[PDB]
Amino acid sequence: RKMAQPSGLVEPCIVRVSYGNNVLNGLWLGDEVICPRHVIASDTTRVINYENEMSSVRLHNFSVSKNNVFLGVVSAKYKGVNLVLKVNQVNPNTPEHKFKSIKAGESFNILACYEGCPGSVYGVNMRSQGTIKGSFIAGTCGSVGYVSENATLYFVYMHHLELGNGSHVGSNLEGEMYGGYEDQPSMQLEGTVMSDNVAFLYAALINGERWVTYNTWAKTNSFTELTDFSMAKTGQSVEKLLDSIVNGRILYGSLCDEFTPTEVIRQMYGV
Protein backbone atom coordinates (compact mmCIF):
# COMPACT_ATOMS: atom_id res chain seq x y z
CA ARG A 1 0.00 0.00 0.00
CA LYS A 2 1.22 3.45 -0.95
CA MET A 3 0.85 5.48 2.24
CA ALA A 4 1.04 9.08 3.43
CA GLN A 5 2.23 10.54 6.71
CA PRO A 6 -0.51 12.15 8.83
CA SER A 7 -1.69 15.59 7.73
CA GLY A 8 -2.71 17.14 11.05
CA LEU A 9 0.03 19.78 11.19
CA VAL A 10 -0.46 20.94 7.58
CA GLU A 11 -4.28 21.16 7.43
CA PRO A 12 -4.61 24.37 9.54
CA CYS A 13 -2.23 26.24 7.19
CA ILE A 14 -4.25 25.84 3.97
CA VAL A 15 -6.11 28.96 2.84
CA ARG A 16 -8.30 29.86 -0.13
CA VAL A 17 -6.53 32.37 -2.39
CA SER A 18 -8.45 33.95 -5.27
CA TYR A 19 -7.56 36.81 -7.62
CA GLY A 20 -9.78 37.62 -10.59
CA ASN A 21 -10.91 34.41 -12.28
CA ASN A 22 -8.28 32.27 -10.51
CA VAL A 23 -9.06 30.33 -7.32
CA LEU A 24 -6.40 28.09 -5.77
CA ASN A 25 -4.63 27.28 -2.49
CA GLY A 26 -2.07 29.02 -0.32
CA LEU A 27 0.23 28.06 2.55
CA TRP A 28 -0.37 30.30 5.58
CA LEU A 29 2.67 30.34 7.87
CA GLY A 30 3.11 33.17 10.34
CA ASP A 31 1.82 36.33 8.68
CA GLU A 32 2.77 35.12 5.18
CA VAL A 33 0.82 33.20 2.54
CA ILE A 34 2.78 31.38 -0.16
CA CYS A 35 0.80 30.65 -3.32
CA PRO A 36 1.51 29.97 -7.00
CA ARG A 37 2.26 33.32 -8.60
CA HIS A 38 0.05 32.50 -11.61
CA VAL A 39 -2.98 33.36 -9.44
CA ILE A 40 -2.59 37.02 -10.49
CA ALA A 41 -2.47 36.18 -14.21
CA SER A 42 -5.28 37.93 -16.08
CA ASP A 43 -5.46 34.94 -18.47
CA THR A 44 -3.81 31.66 -17.47
CA THR A 45 -4.67 30.10 -20.85
CA ARG A 46 -2.30 32.45 -22.74
CA VAL A 47 1.30 33.53 -22.23
CA ILE A 48 1.85 35.58 -19.07
CA ASN A 49 4.13 38.58 -18.61
CA TYR A 50 4.61 38.32 -14.85
CA GLU A 51 6.22 41.76 -14.60
CA ASN A 52 3.14 43.37 -16.16
CA GLU A 53 0.79 41.57 -13.76
CA MET A 54 2.92 42.55 -10.76
CA SER A 55 3.03 46.13 -12.05
CA SER A 56 -0.78 46.19 -12.24
CA VAL A 57 -1.32 44.19 -9.04
CA ARG A 58 -3.96 45.70 -6.74
CA LEU A 59 -3.67 44.25 -3.24
CA HIS A 60 -7.35 44.93 -2.49
CA ASN A 61 -8.40 42.51 -5.26
CA PHE A 62 -6.99 39.49 -3.40
CA SER A 63 -9.23 37.14 -1.42
CA VAL A 64 -7.33 35.13 1.21
CA SER A 65 -9.43 33.24 3.73
CA LYS A 66 -9.47 30.32 6.16
CA ASN A 67 -12.92 29.24 7.42
CA ASN A 68 -14.66 32.53 8.38
CA VAL A 69 -11.40 34.51 8.65
CA PHE A 70 -10.70 37.01 5.87
CA LEU A 71 -6.97 37.70 5.54
CA GLY A 72 -6.31 41.19 4.19
CA VAL A 73 -3.19 41.34 2.03
CA VAL A 74 -0.77 44.10 3.02
CA SER A 75 2.04 43.23 0.59
CA ALA A 76 2.92 40.99 -2.34
CA LYS A 77 6.25 39.88 -3.81
CA TYR A 78 7.53 37.22 -6.18
CA LYS A 79 10.02 34.61 -5.03
CA GLY A 80 10.75 32.44 -8.03
CA VAL A 81 7.52 31.00 -9.41
CA ASN A 82 5.81 31.58 -6.04
CA LEU A 83 3.87 34.59 -4.80
CA VAL A 84 4.50 35.63 -1.19
CA LEU A 85 1.72 37.66 0.43
CA LYS A 86 2.07 39.41 3.78
CA VAL A 87 -1.32 39.32 5.51
CA ASN A 88 -2.81 41.27 8.40
CA GLN A 89 -2.94 38.28 10.78
CA VAL A 90 -0.51 35.61 11.97
CA ASN A 91 -1.63 31.99 11.74
CA PRO A 92 -2.08 30.92 15.39
CA ASN A 93 -1.63 27.28 14.27
CA THR A 94 1.73 27.65 12.53
CA PRO A 95 3.65 24.42 13.25
CA GLU A 96 7.39 24.04 13.61
CA HIS A 97 8.65 23.62 10.07
CA LYS A 98 11.65 23.74 7.75
CA PHE A 99 11.99 23.90 3.97
CA LYS A 100 13.63 21.24 1.82
CA SER A 101 13.88 20.07 -1.78
CA ILE A 102 13.09 16.54 -3.01
CA LYS A 103 15.39 14.54 -5.28
CA ALA A 104 14.38 11.98 -7.89
CA GLY A 105 13.25 8.61 -6.57
CA GLU A 106 12.50 10.04 -3.12
CA SER A 107 9.03 9.94 -1.59
CA PHE A 108 6.89 12.55 0.14
CA ASN A 109 3.25 13.32 0.93
CA ILE A 110 0.72 15.45 -0.97
CA LEU A 111 -2.15 17.18 0.82
CA ALA A 112 -4.53 17.77 -2.08
CA CYS A 113 -6.64 20.89 -1.49
CA TYR A 114 -9.55 22.16 -3.59
CA GLU A 115 -10.05 25.95 -3.61
CA GLY A 116 -8.72 26.23 -0.06
CA CYS A 117 -10.36 23.06 1.29
CA PRO A 118 -8.12 20.09 2.20
CA GLY A 119 -9.71 16.99 0.74
CA SER A 120 -7.18 14.18 0.39
CA VAL A 121 -3.71 13.01 1.38
CA TYR A 122 -1.50 10.52 -0.46
CA GLY A 123 2.15 9.64 -0.90
CA VAL A 124 4.12 10.44 -4.04
CA ASN A 125 7.54 9.78 -5.57
CA MET A 126 9.72 12.37 -7.32
CA ARG A 127 10.08 11.07 -10.88
CA SER A 128 12.74 11.29 -13.61
CA GLN A 129 12.49 14.87 -14.89
CA GLY A 130 11.49 16.33 -11.52
CA THR A 131 7.81 15.45 -11.91
CA ILE A 132 5.36 13.41 -9.84
CA LYS A 133 2.37 11.31 -10.83
CA GLY A 134 -0.44 12.39 -8.53
CA SER A 135 -4.04 13.33 -9.36
CA PHE A 136 -4.56 17.09 -9.60
CA ILE A 137 -7.49 18.90 -11.22
CA ALA A 138 -8.69 22.48 -11.54
CA GLY A 139 -8.41 24.38 -8.27
CA THR A 140 -5.69 22.20 -6.71
CA CYS A 141 -2.70 24.45 -7.44
CA GLY A 142 -1.07 25.49 -4.21
CA SER A 143 -1.54 21.97 -2.86
CA VAL A 144 1.25 21.37 -0.37
CA GLY A 145 3.86 18.63 -0.34
CA TYR A 146 5.44 17.76 2.99
CA VAL A 147 7.72 15.19 4.60
CA SER A 148 8.22 14.41 8.30
CA GLU A 149 11.71 13.19 9.25
CA ASN A 150 12.55 12.63 12.93
CA ALA A 151 10.06 15.03 14.55
CA THR A 152 10.83 17.61 11.83
CA LEU A 153 8.10 18.94 9.54
CA TYR A 154 9.44 19.82 6.09
CA PHE A 155 7.42 21.71 3.48
CA VAL A 156 8.86 20.42 0.20
CA TYR A 157 6.32 21.01 -2.58
CA MET A 158 3.66 23.39 -3.88
CA HIS A 159 1.66 22.43 -6.96
CA HIS A 160 1.77 24.55 -10.11
CA LEU A 161 0.88 22.72 -13.31
CA GLU A 162 0.25 19.47 -15.16
CA LEU A 163 2.24 18.73 -18.31
CA GLY A 164 0.84 17.43 -21.57
CA ASN A 165 1.91 13.90 -20.67
CA GLY A 166 -0.16 14.01 -17.46
CA SER A 167 2.79 14.39 -15.09
CA HIS A 168 2.54 17.01 -12.37
CA VAL A 169 4.99 19.86 -11.77
CA GLY A 170 5.48 22.01 -8.69
CA SER A 171 8.02 24.16 -6.90
CA ASN A 172 9.68 24.05 -3.54
CA LEU A 173 8.62 26.63 -0.99
CA GLU A 174 11.50 28.92 -2.01
CA GLY A 175 10.26 29.28 -5.60
CA GLU A 176 12.45 26.91 -7.65
CA MET A 177 10.35 24.76 -9.99
CA TYR A 178 11.27 21.08 -9.76
CA GLY A 179 12.59 19.91 -13.12
CA GLY A 180 13.26 23.48 -14.25
CA TYR A 181 9.86 23.88 -15.91
CA GLU A 182 8.27 27.30 -16.38
CA ASP A 183 4.85 28.46 -15.17
CA GLN A 184 3.54 29.29 -18.63
CA PRO A 185 0.67 27.66 -20.57
CA SER A 186 3.09 26.95 -23.42
CA MET A 187 3.90 23.29 -23.99
CA GLN A 188 6.84 21.74 -22.16
CA LEU A 189 8.31 18.24 -22.38
CA GLU A 190 9.10 15.73 -19.67
CA GLY A 191 12.00 13.38 -20.24
CA THR A 192 11.51 9.90 -21.63
CA VAL A 193 13.12 6.68 -16.68
CA MET A 194 12.16 4.04 -14.13
CA SER A 195 13.73 3.46 -10.73
CA ASP A 196 15.82 0.70 -6.59
CA ASN A 197 12.04 1.07 -6.54
CA VAL A 198 11.02 -1.64 -9.03
CA ALA A 199 11.76 -3.13 -3.97
CA PHE A 200 8.30 -3.55 -5.52
CA LEU A 201 9.07 -7.13 -6.58
CA TYR A 202 10.64 -7.80 -3.17
CA ALA A 203 7.25 -6.97 -1.66
CA ALA A 204 5.49 -8.82 -4.49
CA LEU A 205 6.97 -12.13 -3.31
CA ILE A 206 6.50 -11.64 0.44
CA ASN A 207 2.77 -11.40 -0.35
CA GLY A 208 2.86 -14.76 -2.16
CA GLU A 209 3.36 -13.77 -5.83
CA ARG A 210 6.43 -15.61 -7.13
CA TRP A 211 5.82 -16.05 -10.87
CA VAL A 212 11.10 -14.77 -10.80
CA THR A 213 12.64 -17.87 -12.38
CA TYR A 214 22.20 -5.21 -15.46
CA ASN A 215 23.32 -1.59 -15.36
CA THR A 216 24.56 -2.24 -18.90
CA TRP A 217 21.00 -3.07 -19.99
CA ALA A 218 19.66 -0.21 -17.86
CA LYS A 219 21.81 2.60 -19.28
CA THR A 220 20.50 2.29 -22.85
CA ASN A 221 16.83 1.54 -22.10
CA SER A 222 15.50 4.14 -19.65
CA PHE A 223 16.17 2.60 -16.23
CA THR A 224 18.11 4.16 -13.38
CA GLU A 225 21.54 2.87 -12.41
CA LEU A 226 22.05 0.46 -9.51
CA THR A 227 22.75 -4.83 -3.40
CA ASP A 228 23.48 -3.51 0.10
CA PHE A 229 17.95 -4.93 0.26
CA SER A 230 19.99 -7.39 2.35
CA MET A 231 17.27 -8.33 4.85
CA ALA A 232 17.42 -12.49 3.06
CA LYS A 233 13.89 -13.12 4.31
CA THR A 234 12.47 -14.22 0.94
CA GLY A 235 15.58 -16.06 -0.27
CA GLN A 236 16.11 -14.42 -3.67
CA SER A 237 19.08 -12.39 -4.90
CA VAL A 238 18.51 -9.02 -6.51
CA GLU A 239 20.04 -10.13 -9.83
CA LYS A 240 17.51 -12.95 -9.61
CA LEU A 241 15.05 -10.02 -9.68
CA LEU A 242 17.02 -7.81 -12.07
CA ASP A 243 16.33 -10.63 -14.56
CA SER A 244 12.58 -10.07 -14.14
CA ILE A 245 13.18 -6.37 -14.82
CA VAL A 246 14.60 -7.32 -18.22
CA ASN A 247 9.42 -5.44 -18.88
CA GLY A 248 -1.53 -11.12 -18.57
CA ARG A 249 -0.72 -11.79 -14.92
CA ILE A 250 1.96 -8.12 -9.58
CA LEU A 251 0.05 -7.05 -6.46
CA TYR A 252 -0.72 -4.22 -11.33
CA GLY A 253 0.12 -5.09 -14.93
CA SER A 254 3.42 -3.19 -15.13
CA LEU A 255 6.59 -2.64 -13.05
CA CYS A 256 5.99 -0.28 -10.12
CA ASP A 257 8.68 2.31 -9.33
CA GLU A 258 6.77 4.37 -6.75
CA PHE A 259 7.95 2.82 -3.45
CA THR A 260 11.42 3.46 -2.08
CA PRO A 261 13.16 0.41 -0.55
CA THR A 262 13.09 2.09 2.87
CA GLU A 263 9.36 2.69 2.80
CA VAL A 264 8.39 -0.84 1.62
CA ILE A 265 10.59 -2.30 4.38
CA ARG A 266 9.37 0.17 7.04
CA GLN A 267 5.94 -1.08 6.03
CA MET A 268 6.55 -4.84 5.85
CA TYR A 269 9.04 -5.12 8.75
CA GLY A 270 8.04 -1.82 10.40
CA VAL A 271 9.92 -0.22 13.27
- The CA R_g of the chain, rounded to the nearest whole Å, is 21
Among 7, 42, 224, 244, binds a copy of itself (CB under 8 A): 7
Smallest distance from a copy of itself to CB 61, Å: 24
Nearer to a copy of itself, 105 or 134 (CB): 134
Q: Which DSSP helix (H) or strand (E) runs through 23?
A: strand 22-29
Give the Cα separation of 117 and 22 in Å (integer): 15
From 35-43, 113-121, 182-190, 224-232, span contacting a copy of itself (CB under 8 A): 113-121
Q: Which of 130, 139, 142, 170 is catalytic?
A: 139
Nearer to a copy of itself, 39 or 112 (CB): 112
Q: Which residues are 71's β-sheet partners? A: 64
Say whether 141 is catalytic.
yes
Smallest distance from ligand A1D7M to CB 149, Å: 25
Nearer to ligand A1D7M, 56 or 152 (CB): 56
Say whether 139 is catalytic.
yes
Give the Cα separation of 26 and 158 in Å (integer): 9
Q: Which of 35, 141, 160, 179 is catalytic?
A: 141
Going by C-alpha positions, the residue among 167, 159, 172 that lies closest to residue 188 is: 167
CA quadruple 241, 243, 246, 248: dihedral sign: negative
Phi, psi of 206 (to 5 degrees): -70, -25
Say whether 159 is catalytic.
no
Question: How many residues in total does the chain contain?
Answer: 271
Going by C-alpha positions, the residue among 12, 20, 68 that lies closest to residue 44 is: 20
Nearer to a copy of itself, 162 or 174 (CB): 162
**What residues line the site for ligand A1D7M (CB under 6 A)?**
24, 38, 44, 136-141, 160-164, 168, 183-186, 188
Nearer to ligand A1D7M, 44 or 171 (CB): 44
CB 226 within 8 A of CB 218: yes
Q: Name residues contacting a copy of itself, limited to 228-267 (CB under 8 A).
A: 248-250, 252-254, 256, 266-267
List alpha helices for 16-132, DSSP H: 50-55
Smallest distance from ligand A1D7M to CB 247, Å: 29
Give the Cα separation of 42 and 38 in Å (integer): 9
Q: Where do contacts with a copy of itself occur on this chain (CB under 8 A)?
A: 1-8, 11-12, 111-112, 114-115, 118-123, 133-140, 162, 166, 168, 207-208, 248-250, 252-254, 256, 266-271
Q: Supply the residues annotated as catalytic.
A: 38, 139, 141
